[PDB]
Each structure stands twice: as structure tokens, then as C-alpha cells.
RNA sequence: UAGCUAGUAGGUGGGGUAACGGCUCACCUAGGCGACGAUCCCUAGCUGGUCUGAGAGGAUGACCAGCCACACUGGAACUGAGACACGGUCCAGACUCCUACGGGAGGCAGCAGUGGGGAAUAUUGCACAAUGGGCGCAAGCCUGAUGCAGCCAUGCCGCGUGUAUGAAGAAGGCCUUCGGGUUGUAAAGUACUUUCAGCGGGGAGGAAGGGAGUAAAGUUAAUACCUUUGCUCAUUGACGUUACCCGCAGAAGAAGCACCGGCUAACUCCGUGCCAGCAGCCGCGGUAAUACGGAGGGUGCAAGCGUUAAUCGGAAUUACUGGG
RNA sequence: AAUUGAAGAGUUUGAUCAUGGCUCAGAUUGAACGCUGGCGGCAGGCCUAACACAUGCAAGUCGAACGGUAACAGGAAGAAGCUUGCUUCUUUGCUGACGAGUGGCGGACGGGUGAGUAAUGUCUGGGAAACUGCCUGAUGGAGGGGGAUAACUACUGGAAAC
């Protein structure tokens, strides 16, 4: 079934996550329905680094998709306002 | 010859003790001829009687081994060094090449 | 990395000085210019059309003190940019950190400038920078940090620095061991020695 | 490789499948496919792409990702939402092991690793700390996925192996018209700096969460209880002598490789004498070899260099663009 | 704000111009070998025998589905040794739990490989005659009964598996 989850494409010892809508059976790096944001935990002092289109995430929750615990935490971090 | 050239303490044993036709004096005298290890001195040797098939022993052999190890001290390094010599080396199909090291 | 060899042989082979030594005096006696190094250099060269291209590649490369693989990377970047490739080549070479230190006159020579940037004397916008190849931006202050401040190394250099004709694209400063890089070099600002179509031509074949 | 097809091609009816269907059967008709290359043989996993190329094109499908196929060989079904099932099952075959010899057990084209092949490709490692799965209300357990380390200049990229001054134009080497020239500011000497290694200290971030106590709202018989939203207090790092920063000492620990007849950047002497050998191509060597062997000098490139093999380019030398 | 680019030389002849092959300068690899080799970052690392394999490890998990004690970790009760306040030792599923077992869900995913496959395949653009556990929205039921069986006990065939 559909799950909102963090996939890691970044370099060795510098994870850069791509928050993404995918089925549960597929591997972390594998097949997916669509991208929805990104999350850099390593980050830098610049303002950008956590981004998520909420109209997309609320749509997928409306279609019944469940949310991975990190992405669930990042949604309740960014809210309307952090 | 291997005992003198490697400088090794030497012990001997009679194999055929059970037989009366296999008397110890023939064995004792015939290897006494050599220019190193003559026999029946009570020094530089110890004589053993062991059955071929039973066998018999081991106290007399054990005493001979104990006396040579008591007469010359034997020690080994117990930290930071591992060393020895190779007995036999072979190849096994499942485990690979192996070797038996003393 | 680095040439490491005798400096004057390169100037004598190229037949025009490359400024590699040139601290205390611009001495004629040592240089022996246009006589060529080694046994048979006395004879007239009668150089080929391939050789005049290959010579000019070495002449430019030996000024900045680059190796062919690093130098090739500047050519690839200069080519993809709009406008003249030779000018965008010389802009990236002049944009080096070890080069700006020589232009500001903090170091006596380009090798001493590379030594000071390697030895972590030099800071750009308050970052320390190890890498000599580092690409300086417009609006970049540059300075010596406290450990390397007021040593015999910088102090002798700042004296002989006054003789120079003084660059047009940067502010010199240097009353308190710093400098500011204002804007890009352009073809008029930089020297007339280089034949710029010629060095680019050699990579075409 | 020019003829190939009987369930072959079409219809009706029955049976079958989740569902269309010659899917499978009975019966009826005589068609189907075929030079716009059927059928047969050889060879081949395919594509997003990679590599080359001015583009058109050509070659190619490792890594990464999508999809299909296969799981000792050969065949079949069950269970199940989904398999005709890589570490499930049953039978036959090959083959290995075990055995009281009657009869049984096993399938690294999983991760490591070994035999063997071959020119040649690694440690019988650490941890669920992180991401993501499986189960569970949850704690938690499991996870050779994955995250990480070890090993190899295999490739790409960065940096270093010092800097400045310095004529005595030193000594030594090499050549010489035996006057000298060159090696060579190179050295030596003197003045400076110590990056990265070595040695001693300090020290980010990857951790959000989860747990135990509490308050409020929702809740109901209820202040329970439970869930949610705040809060406080204990904490959670495999990698890890982490990244990174400071300190100490002293030029100290750190440059090789090919090539120099023309093509093609870079020259003389000596040895050998069509011998020895060089050679990518045309070619050099049979007594003064700028081409062999050695030495000096020089040129290119750099922790790599060269050779060889493989692909495209140059090649308008399969030419559509672009030939005869 | 934006998608810029094309080099030739040597070699047939006494000499020339064509035709025309051969060869070289370029870039590159999942490379090998030779000589040489200080450190770091990042990436890669059996292309050959889909040849065969030792040993260890790679799929299990739920007591909030259920009989249960095979555990061992306590409590309680009880019996003892006396130190009369304590250890000791039998009972007891009462309990924090939990082997084997019943039952649930996962084992069809994750991972490896390029042997076979030139069309049941793949890629691109469309379609109807379909299913779809796990995941969601919507509307209602969730009443009342029965017979087994493994485990476990009592035995027994088997070298071992079974």
C-alpha cells in the first residue's frame, strides 16, 4: 500500500533525503509514485533545507496513504509555521 | 646420525619383549656397536621394555622423557611472539590450502 | 604536484623571462636569456608550426605553475562559457588564490605565494583556504592571519612590492596586511605577452 | 533458409478461467500466413542511458534506476490476495555426503569465503546508531536490505615532496676547434616558512524520536481509564584515536617514467660492425650509426608513466546529411 | 535570463597529378602487464566455468488468538534446618514471563544472476471483457449451538533421518 517515506540519494556520510510517495513493497531507493519534498538533516545556515508541498501530502492522506515516523515528525515540525 | 647431528638426547625401546626368542641382550648388544650411543653404561641412555601388540608401559618411557626434560631446561616465550615449524602442508577442497605447524 | 626544478632553465628555454626568481634584483648575469639551456642550444632553432603552438602552451602554463590535467579543466570551463575562450581561460587562471597573493604583493614570488596559501597564512572573507587553485570572487577581501603576521617572510616581501606597476582590477590596501578583489580582469587589463587564439588552437586538433 | 501451417484459419455449441480467447473439447466450413521477408538457422536479456562524434550517425547496455526471465538438471501441483514458489513441497534424473549399507540426507546463479577456471578483480569484519522493511497495541525482537569499516594508484579529482637569497660561474661529470663551452642559481653557503604525514591535547554534526512523571482538552457514570495536545525530568552514535581545531619539533619523512631519423616537441660522443638488435609507419645497422647498446645533455608528463588489448574518431574509406 | 561548431600528416614514382589501401597524431575503459609509488577526498572492484563447494551467517514474529508449564525470574502458601528471623527445600500458573505446540500474519517482498529468449518478451501510444489481502471513505450486522485434533500423557517400529 501507499506510504509517505524518506529515501536517501545523498553521498556517503552526508545523507540528503527525498521525501516521496511510494508503495511499501518497493525498496527504499526503488520505484515510486511521486516526489513531494526534501530533507537535509546535515544542512547549512541557509534558510532552505526542509521543504514539503502540503497540498500534495494532504491529498495522499485523503487517498488513505500512511506516513513514516520521520516524515510525520517533519510535518509536525514545519506545520503552517514552525 | 640424526640424533647426533641435531644434538638430541636419545632413548631406545625393545619391541618384541613377549617372545622368549626375541631376548633383550641381542637387541642391546647389536646397537651398542656405534661410536655414539653404546649401551649398558647406565649413563647417556635409558632402556625400555614394551609389548609390540598389547602394548605395555607407559611409566618407563614417561620416566625417560621426564628425566631428559629435567636434565636440560625447556622454556617458551608467552607474550608478543608466535613461532614454530611446519610438519606437513596440504590442500583440502572445502577449506583450501592448510598446514600443520608445531 | 609543482615543477620543483631549476627556475631559470624554463625562462631560458622559452626565451622570455617568467619572473620565477626575481626578488632582490632582475639580474641579467644569472639569466643568460636567449642562449638556451644545455650543450647544443647555441644553434638557431628554426621552429615548426606545431612547435610554436606547443611552446606557447608551456609559456603560459609555466607562469601560473600549473600541470596539464588541472590546466585542461580550466580550458573545459572556459570553452562552455559564452564569449572568447582564451580570455575566459586567462580569467580563470588570474582568478586563482595563489595568483592574487602575488598580485597584492604579500609574497615575493608565485612559489612563495603558493607556499603561504598551503601553509595556511592566507584567509579569504575570514575563511582560511588551503587550496591554491581556489577561485576568487568579485567582492572578496583577503588577508594574512595572526600567526603569519609580521614575520620575516611577509616583511621582506612588502618592501620589494613597491617597485611593481600595480594591478587595475583590485584594490591594493596593505597598510594592515590585507587586500580587496574588486572586479574581473579583461583583455586590456592583462599583459600583451600571450597570443590567445594560438594557445586555444592547439587543443582543437 | 522460399514455401510454411490440423487446433493450423474461421464459425456454432458444450466445457474451462478472476475475465476476453482454439483457452480446451465435439461438430461444421476450407481457409490462415508469405518477398512491406513467412518459415528455418546462427547470434542476442531489453529500455531510460553510457561512450564516441560538429551534427547526422556509429559502437555499446558495467555502475545507478524501470521491466522481464531463471533458481543442481527435467516435470507437475498444492497452500494462498499474490507463486506453479532463490534459503517452500512432491516425484524422476545427474552428482556429493552419511550409514548398522537395508535406506536416508544436500543444492552459495544470498553475504563472506574456498577449490577450479582465467591475464585479472577484495575481509570466513562491525552495528541495527541512521534510513527502509517483516511481525506486534506498544515496548521490543528480527533484518550479510541498508548504513559502515578493512583491502587494491583500478579510475576521477585535490594536495605535498619546501621557499627566498646565492658566482666561487665551486668541486665532480660530459663535450671541445683544447681558446673554452655546458651541466649550473642547480649545488654549496647564508636567510626564512612547516602545509600534509609523525607525536600530544581539545572536539561539531549525523537524534528526530522513544521512555517515565505531569497539566489541560476530548471522554464517559467518571474525577476513571484510554487516546490527543503542551510541559518537565532521565536519556538514546555502529561508524569513532570521526569531521574539524589548536600545540610541539625540524628542511626534517616523501619523484619517478617515457621519448629525442622524418611523421613529432627535443643531440653529441663512445662501443658493436647487415652481427647484436631496433621498428607504430616509411625504415635504420655490412668501420665516423643524431634510428642499435652505453654515457652526457635535452624534451614531454606526473604519483603516476609507458606498452598491449578493446571501442568510436580522423575515414566524404558504405559517402541520408556527405562518394562514384 | 540560457543552450556556439567541423585541423591533418606519412607512405606507391627517377620526378608529377589523380585513384586507392595501410598506418599515425585524438578521446576512452568494469582493464591487464612492466617499471616506479607519500598522503587525502569521492566513486568503482570475478566481464572467464549458469563449474563445483567445507564451515558460519542471509526470515521470522505475536501470551493483547489458545491449551500449557519445557524454562528460570519472583511472590504467596507450606514443610524443614533453628540462627525465632532467617536462609534452606517441596507445593501452587498466582504472577513478570516464555521453549516446544496449536492458531494468526509474513516466507510471492527485500537480495542475487544474464543461462534460455529475435517474440508467450521489451519499448512507445491506446483499449475493455477483470481481479486486487494489507490501506481508506460510505451504510448496516456482530444472534445461538456442536463435534474433533496436535501438544501432553501410556506404549512402540527405526542405524539415522523419520
Amino acid at each position: 500500500m501507499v506510504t509517505i517515506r524518506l529515501a536517501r540519494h545523498g553521498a556517503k556520510k552526508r545523507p540528503f533525503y527525498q521525501v516521496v510517495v511510494a508503495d511499501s513493497r518497493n525498496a527504499r531507493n526503488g520505484r515510486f509514485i511521486e516526489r513531494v519534498g526534501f530533507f537535509n538533516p546535515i544542512a547549512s545556515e541557509k534558510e532552505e533545507g526542509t521543504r514539503l508541498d502540503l497540498d500534495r501530502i494532504a491529498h495522499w492522506v485523503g487517498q488513505g496513504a500512511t506516513i513514516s515516523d520521520r516524515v510525520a515528525a517533519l510535518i509536525k515540525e514545519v506545520n503552517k509555521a514552525a | 646420525q640424526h640424533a647426533k647431528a641435531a644434538q638430541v638426547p636419545v632413548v631406545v625401546a625393545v619391541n618384541k619383549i613377549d617372545k622368549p626368542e626375541a631376548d633383550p641382550d641381542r637387541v642391546k648388544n647389536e646397537l651398542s656397536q656405534y661410536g655414539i650411543l653404546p649401551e649398558e653404561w647406565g649413563g647417556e641412555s635409558q632402556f625400555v621394555h614394551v609389548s609390540a601388540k598389547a602394548g605395555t608401559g607407559i611409566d618407563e618411557l614417561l620416566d625417560a622423557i621426564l628425566l631428559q626434560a629435567e636434565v636440560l631446561e625447556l622454556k617458551a616465550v608467552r607474550k608478543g611472539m608466535a613461532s614454530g615449524a611446519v610438519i606437513e602442508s596440504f590442500l583440502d577442497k572445502g577449506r583450501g590450502p592448510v598446514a600443520t605447524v608445531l | 604536484a609543482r615543477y620543483l626544478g631549476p627556475k631559470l632553465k624554463l625562462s631560458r628555454r622559452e626565451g622570455t623571462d617568467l619572473f620565477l626568481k626575481s626578488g632582490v634584483r632582475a639580474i641579467d648575469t644569472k639569466c643568460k636569456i636567449e642562449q638556451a639551456p644545455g650543450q647544443h642550444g647555441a644553434r638557431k632553432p628554426r621552429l615548426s608550426d606545431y612547435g610554436v603552438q606547443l611552446r606557447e602552451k608551456q609559456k603560459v602554463r609555466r607562469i601560473y605553475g600549473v600541470l596539464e590535467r588541472q590546466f585542461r579543466n580550466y580550458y573545459k570551463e572556459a570553452a562552455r562559457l559564452k564569449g572568447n575562450t582564451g580570455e575566459n581561460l586567462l580569467a580563470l587562471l588570474e582568478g586563482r588564490l595563489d595568483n592574487v597573493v602575488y598580485r597584492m604583493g604579500f609574497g615575493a614570488t608565485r612559489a612563495e605565494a603558493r607556499q603561504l596559501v598551503s601553509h595556511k597564512a592566507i584567509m579569504v572573507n575570514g575563511r582560511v583556504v588551503n587550496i591554491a587553485s581556489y577561485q576568487v570572487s568579485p567582492n572578496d577581501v583577503v588577508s594574512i592571519r595572526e600567526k603569519a603576521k609580521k614575520q620575516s617572510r611577509v616583511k621582506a616581501a612588502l618592501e620589494l612590492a613597491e617597485q611593481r606597476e600595480k594591478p587595475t582590477w583590485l584594490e591594493v590596501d596593505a597598510g594592515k596586511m590585507e587586500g580587496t578583489f574588486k572586479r574581473k580582469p579583461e583583455r586590456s587589463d592583462l599583459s600583451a605577452d600571450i597570443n590567445e587564439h594560438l594557445i586555444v588552437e592547439l587543443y582543437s586538433k
Side-chain angles (χ1 to χ4, degrees):
Chain A
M1 82 300 186
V2 288
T3 62
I4 315 183
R5 66 178 186 170
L6 299 182
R8 193 219 281 197
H9 285 276
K12 186 171 93 297
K13 289 175 169 168
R14 190 151 291 199
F16 193 95
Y17 294 100
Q18 296 286 343
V19 62
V20 67
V21 183
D23 182 270
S24 54
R25 294 163 287 180
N26 297 302
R28 180 192 66 213
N29 298 1
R31 180 168 170 188
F32 64 93
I33 301 178
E34 65 182 64
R35 181 176 177 246
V36 59
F38 54 79
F39 174 54
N40 191 346
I42 307 304
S44 188
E45 199 55 62
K46 69 195 185 185
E47 189 172 295
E48 192 55 90
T50 305
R51 213 182 77 215
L52 296 94
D53 292 297
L54 298 177
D55 295 295
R56 299 310 302 153
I57 297 292
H59 167 270
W60 288 98
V61 173
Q63 305 300 262
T66 59
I67 313 179
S68 188
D69 299 294
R70 288 291 280 258
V71 181
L74 292 167
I75 290 165
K76 192 187 171 184
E77 197 287 305
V78 73
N79 309 287
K80 296 184 178 181
Chain B
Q1 186 174 245
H2 296 186
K4 184 183 175 183
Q7 308 292 348
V8 198
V10 59
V11 179
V12 297
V14 186
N15 287 332
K16 299 297 185 72
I17 69 170
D18 302 286
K19 280 181 168 298
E21 62 179 305
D23 53 288
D25 291 297
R26 179 163 68 255
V27 174
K28 179 202 291 175
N29 284 275
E30 213 66 70
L31 297 185
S32 194
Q33 67 179 344
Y34 302 113
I36 183 64
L37 196 64
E39 189 49 76
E40 205 177 59
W41 289 90
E44 73 178 290
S45 192
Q46 180 164 346
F47 203 81
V48 191
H49 291 302
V50 289
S51 181
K53 295 287 187 171
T56 53
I58 201 70
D59 300 73
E60 304 79 4
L61 190 65
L62 174 61
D63 184 63
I65 293 167
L66 185 60
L67 177 62
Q68 303 311 310
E70 188 175 67
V71 166
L72 50 145
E73 193 65 71
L74 299 174
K75 293 183 174 182
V77 177
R78 304 309 198 89
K79 54 185 176 183
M81 175 55 65
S83 183
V86 186
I87 304 156
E88 184 177 71
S89 58
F90 60 100
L91 184 142
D92 185 62
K93 189 174 185 292
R95 296 166 183 86
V98 294
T100 49
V101 172
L102 183 65
Chain C
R2 309 175 66 227
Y3 168 52
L4 308 172
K7 301 181 294 300
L8 270 61
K9 298 176 81 82
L10 301 182
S11 286
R12 199 180 295 133
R13 178 54 64 202
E14 272 59 95
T16 298
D17 195 61
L18 303 175
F19 312 110
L20 297 172
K21 189 189 148 65
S22 308
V24 173
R25 45 177 172 156
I27 187 59
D28 297 296
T29 306
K30 298 187 171 71
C31 69
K32 288 165 55 62
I33 201 67
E34 305 186 67
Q35 300 176 21
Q39 301 180 334
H40 300 159
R43 199 181 298 143
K44 297 174 287 185
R46 315 190 79 162
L47 193 61
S48 69
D49 297 294
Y50 181 69
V52 69
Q53 292 171 73
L54 188 62
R55 196 45 47 216
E56 188 74 3
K57 185 179 75 66
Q58 303 296 80
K59 186 193 292 169
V60 177
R61 206 177 79 212
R62 292 166 178 183
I63 290 285
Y64 295 87
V66 196
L67 294 181
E68 189 61 20
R69 250 55 65 111
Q70 185 158 97
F71 197 76
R72 198 65 58 93
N73 294 328
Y74 301 145
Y75 179 73
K76 290 294 189 68
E77 186 56 58
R80 60 172 293 263
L81 187 59
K82 289 83 168 183
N84 195 18
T85 292
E87 291 171 57
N88 295 336
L89 182 61
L90 292 167
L92 290 167
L93 287 163
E94 199 60 45
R96 290 178 60 116
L97 182 54
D98 59 357
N99 182 75
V100 85
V101 173
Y102 179 76
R103 295 302 187 192
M104 294 298 183
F106 306 144
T109 65
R110 293 176 169 272
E112 189 176 76
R114 188 172 293 159
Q115 182 166 102
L116 284 164
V117 174
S118 294
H119 293 189
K120 297 178 172 178
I122 309 303
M123 299 200 303
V124 184
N125 305 313
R127 286 188 174 194
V128 66
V129 181
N130 192 242
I131 305 95
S133 191
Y134 182 91
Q135 187 57 225
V136 181
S137 179
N139 309 110
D140 279 357
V141 299
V142 58
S143 61
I144 308 179
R145 70 180 183 146
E146 302 89 289
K147 301 302 303 299
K149 190 187 292 182
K150 70 173 182 179
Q151 299 303 120
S152 297
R153 172 68 70 201
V154 58
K155 191 174 174 65
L158 293 175
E159 183 184 293
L160 55 79
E162 186 184 73
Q163 298 177 111
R164 308 176 300 135
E165 55 71 58
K166 306 167 190 68
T168 45
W169 59 86
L170 51 74
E171 301 301 304
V172 67
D173 203 280
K176 53 278 199 294
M177 303 190 179
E178 59 191 357
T180 305
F181 186 92
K182 182 170 66 188
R183 61 83 174 174
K184 299 173 65 177
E186 194 170 294
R187 184 63 196 106
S188 54
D189 295 286
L190 65 98
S191 204
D193 301 298
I194 308 93
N195 294 299
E196 325 91 300
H197 60 81
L198 186 64
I199 186 166
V200 171
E201 192 174 10
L202 184 58
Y203 288 127
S204 300
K205 61 90 218 61

